[PDB]
Every structure is written in C-alpha cells, then in structure tokens.
C-alpha cells in the first residue's frame, strides 16, 4: 500500500527503495503520534515537518554529485626507490611474481616443436619448456 503512495511514486525509480524505506519509518512515527494524541487535538505539525524532510531527502537522492575535477596523471618520474624483501613482503610479491614454472614455460626449446596443450577453447597454448624433455616424451608433470 505505501509504495503506491504519491509521496514515493512521484519521484524517480532510482530513489523509490530508499524513499519507501524513509516513508515507512516516518509513517510509523506519524501513527505513533496519532496514537499518543487525544481526540480533538489534530496537531499535525510534526507530520508536516516529516513530509518536508522526506521531500528534501528525495531531492538529494535525485541530485547527483557535482562533476569531479578530472584527477591528474602523476608527473611521470620513473622512481625505482623501493628495494625490499621479507618473508612477510615476499609472499605478496610472490602473487605478482612470474613463478618458476611460468618462467620455464616462457622458455621455448629452439629446434624442437614446442609442447602445446589442446584446450578446447583454444589450442594456441604453449606448455613451453616447463615439462622436461624426457618427461614430455613420456607424459605429464
């Protein structure tokens, strides 16, 4: 029922979820207030305020961020300062190192036709010189 209200359904669909949520809570608050009140009081100032707030919220949600001042490319200097290592640090860097098997693969034997693998997606793949010659001749690793 609430989602089909004017208060939500006037705004864009971007906002509806958040707007709906807002409405629920404010609606609840309003109800509580009503319950609290005695008959023939009809204050209805709090509700007005809530409505105003809701409207404001809606407006904010519809409005986007002001354009970003295009973040600059850093003054290209080519620093090689770092120079570190550590059981700690060498792990992380291990994830970004080419590992020894990959290095081996990258090596291709000169005369020989190099060991490929036929991935059904693409045969192209070069298993390279990660498999030892004898090993390759026999089988896998």
């Amino acid at each position: 029922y609430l989602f089909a209200s004017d208060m939500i359904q006037k705004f864009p669909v971007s906002v509806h979820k958040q707007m709906l949520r807002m409405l629920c809570a404010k609606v609840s608050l309003a109800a509580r207030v009503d319950a609290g009140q005695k008959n023939g009081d009809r204050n209805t100032v709090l509700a007005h305020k809530w409505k105003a707030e809701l409207s404001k919220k809606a407006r904010k949600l519809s409005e986007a961020p002001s354009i970003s001042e295009t973040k600059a490319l850093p003054i290209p200097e080519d620093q090689p300062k770092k120079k570190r290592a550590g059981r700690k640090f060498r792990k992380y860097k291990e994830k970004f190192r080419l590992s020894h098997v990959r290095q081996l693969q990258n090596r291709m034997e000169f005369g020989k036709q190099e060991q490929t693998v036929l991935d059904s997606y693409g045969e192209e793949v070069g298993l390279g010189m990660s498999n030892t010659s004898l090993q390759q001749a026999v089988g896998a690793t």
Binding site: A25, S28, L29, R32, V33, A35, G36, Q37, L46
Partner: protein
C-alpha cells in the same frame, strides 16, 4: 530541562547504572537500539527492560513504548540524554529507545535484574 511526560526519569546514579548495563548489553549482543527494535522486542517478549530518552524531541514518537511496556509488564525508564544512551549502545548518533533483552545464560544477567528492580521501584 526534561519533558514531564518522559516518566519515570531515572535518578543520576541510577541512570549511570542503566547506561553501564546497556554498554555491557551492547557488548554481549543482548541489546536492541532504537524505537522500532525496542517495539519489536516488546512484541516478542524478549525485552527485560526498556530505556528511553527524555530529550527525545518530539517526545511523542517515543511515548507508545511506555504504554506497550505497561501492557506487557516490563520495567521502563527514561534516561535524560539520548546522546548518552546512543554512546552507551555504541552509536555516535542519537538513540532514543533501547531494550536490554532476555538471555538467562548472560554474564550480566544479575546486573540486568538489578536494573529492572530499580526501574520497578521507580514506577509506582
């Protein structure tokens, strides 16, 4: 100065004690911040006692909770500061209502019970 309809307002020391309990409750996941959560707790029956805020403005968003408590026979207080309550709960934002809930096996059961007793004494 605090609202008349915010009743019973807890005495300074008592208030402090309540806050401490809440903090403990927060730590233990025994506590439920906020009007709506508090209301839910009451409905469930899990609420041991309800801690409200005198400086909740507009007060009347609060004032169902007391009624609910009365109808459920649950002790309830107001403390004076919403901000303080929020802090106790572990929320930088103003909290106005909270519920310390039931859990027999809690470390702080005894503390909670004490606070409940105090609250009851306040009521009349």
């Amino acid at each position: 100065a605090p609202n008349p309809k915010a009743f019973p307002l807890a005495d300074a020391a008592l208030t402090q004690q309540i806050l401490d309990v809440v903090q403990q409750a927060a730590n233990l996941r025994q506590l439920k911040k906020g009007a709506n959560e508090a209301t839910k707790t009451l409905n469930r029956g899990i609420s041991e006692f309800i801690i409200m805020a005198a400086d909740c403005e507009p007060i009347e968003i609060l004032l169902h909770l007391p009624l609910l408590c009365e109808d459920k026979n649950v002790p309830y207080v107001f403390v004076p500061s919403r901000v303080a309550l929020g802090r106790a709960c572990g929320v930088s934002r103003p909290v106005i209502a909270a519920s310390i809930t039931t859990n027999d096996a809690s470390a702080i059961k005894t503390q909670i019970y004490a606070v409940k007793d105090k609250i009851e004494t306040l009521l009349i």
